[PDB]
Structures are given as C-alpha cells and as structure tokens.
C-alpha cells in the first residue's frame, strides 16, 4: 500500500533502549543520526534489532523547517 | 539555543508552493526528497525562498518506524 | 511493511475536498466520520476518490484521550 | 465544550499500563483495537481504569491515509 | 470531560484566516500571540469569532522544549 | 535560526522527571502550568534542570482549539 506520510528516510537501526511503555530507535541516514520515539508494542511486532534496515516515515504536517 | 527536537536534516529548498493558510516546502536531503507542510505566517517570517539551505526538524515522537 | 503506527482503522472515502496545499479527506468508519488533512500530492500519489476503501492511520503518540 | 479535533472515536478502556513517564492506553473501537500513549498524569487526573467508557481524540493534521 | 492534552492555555481570539481546507487562528494568550491551523470545518463547528474566548490545548508529546 | 514551529512560550523548569525513554518536563507559564514529554536524550543534551528559563514550542498543526 501507497503511505500518505511523505517523508520516507532509508535508513538502518543502530540502537534500541526499551522502556515500560516507549522504546527509543537510534537509527543512521546516511551518515546523520535520526531518534525515534514509538511503542515497545511496535519494537516487538517489527521485531526490530540494530543492524535492520528500516524506512523511518514523517508526515508533511510533523515536519518544521529551520533558517 | 539547542532544539529537543532530534531529528536535524540539512537540506535544500527546491520548491515552494503558496496556499491561503499552508505552504508546501519541497526540500532536498542528499538526493531525498523531503516535503513540509507549514504556515505561510512562516515562509514570510523565514523568508524562505528556492535554494535556502534549511535545517529540517522532526520530534523523536513524531517518527514512526516501517519494516 | 509492518508500521509502527499503532491505530488502523478500515475505512472508506466518502469525499475529498482539494485546496492549494492540504487536502480534506471525509472516510466513513463503521458509521463513524473521519476526517484527514494530508497534502494533494499525497491525493495525487494514491490516487484517492470517493468509494477508496482506505486504510486510516494514527500514531499511538498523537492519540489523546477524554474521560 | 467542542473540540477542533476532528476524530472523535467513542471507545472503552481494555488495558493500561504504566511507566515512569509515559502509559500505555489499550481500547476497544467497535472492534478494533487503538493504542494511544499518553502521561501518566494524565491516567490519574482522568482516573482512567479498564471499563471506562472514553473518547480517543486524534487531530485531522495527524491521521494519515494509505491505499 | 477531561481531556488527557496536558496544555491548557486559556485565550482569546485575534484573527481567523480561512483557506480551502485550513484554517489560521491566531490568538492572544496573556499577551503573547499564538497561531493554530485547524479544519475550516472546525471553525464553523466551534462557530469561532474574533473576540471569543478560547482554549488552546496542546499533547505534551507535541511539546518541544528551547534552551 | 529561525524557526516555523510558531508558538513560543517563555517558561521556567519546575520539576523534571526521567523515566527509561522519555522525560516529563514541567513549566510555569506566566502562573500556568506546561507539561512537555521530551527524550531523555534532550534533557541531557540541553542540561535542563528546575529553575531553567526555556521556550516551550509548539507547531501550529499540532494545536488545537476548544470553545
């Protein structure tokens, strides 16, 4: 399926700390480092460890601009 | 000032588009395009014009994570 | 691709409304109406019409609750 | 008093679970499952427990379409 | 009800810009100016009017912090 | 910089309280009360303690209004 959320970043996760409800993803995009803040839920149902290659998704409307 | 937002993109304004309220900014990241979606009010402010190099920020809790 | 937006809801397109920039989704949801703004281009890239059926999605973060 | 939120979705509470910052709110949506993740502030002002009859709230701007 | 969003920022209206889809209010809030972009369904909805007092509400997850 | 992000609040830290992930932040904003939930990360990066005089920020899509 097509996704609405403009921004797709191909990037690859570097690292995972899992708390009791939030799980941060630190993940490298060619060469910047992008953080992450989703559910331990959707760390499972991913089953994302470092080393994966994943799409990091950013809607339009999320997304603020710096001059 | 530091920003908390995590998610710091260099990028390259390549298009702008004017709507009455919200403005659509068209940015390049190392050959990715990234698409925005804020006020006008900002664009103004900002002065943001094609070929601005801008800082795209994204909340950690706004990045969702696809695989 | 998994997604780790947690909330999917199947829905369908009843109308769009298309400005400059954004445009108004209207889906029906077992009975429930619910509206998205997303950018045109996103309506563009899907190509979205009235009867789509659709898939509505939230991130668990942007989700509040009232009691 | 109303809500620009345009999402109303009228729910019970399944589940809740507790971290030090963040809680997980598990719900039921005329058979669908929603996840939302808010303050733990916010479960003890609301005096959220499972059986509470709730409204997941999610703006316009935040819901995503995908086809 | 209550509402988990943790901001509540009691306010009055200043201006409203109306577009296809969007919205722009701009309001006063112990005199600093604030500026939300919401549905034009939600101002007819709310039937806002410049004069009116309002509150703002914003998800703490929403909130950035500047230092 | 500047930045599109278009509310700024000029508040002072109350109280900060680190969970594994994320971190409630706690403001006085000309006598009201901000609650943000940020990365552990940016508390660490930005050095914020009680008594720190800040900028709340909030994008203009992620407000909503109540009337």
């Known amino acids: ?4 959320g ?3 970043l191909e990037a690859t996760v570097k690292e995972i700390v899992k708390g009791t ?3 941060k993803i630190v993940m490298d ?3 910047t480092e992008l953080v992450a803040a989703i559910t331990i ?3 499972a149902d ?5 080393g994966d290659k994943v799409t990091a998704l950013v ?3 999320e997304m603020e601009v710096l001059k």
Do not use: C, W
């Open 59 to 61: 809607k339009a409307t």
């Open 21 to 23: 409800v939030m799980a």
């Open 29 to 31: 995009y060619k060469g």
């Open 46 to 50: 991913l089953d994302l460890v470092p």
């Open 41 to 43: 839920d959707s760390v």
């Open 1 to 4: 399926m097509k996704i609405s």
């Open 6 to 8: 403009r921004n797709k």
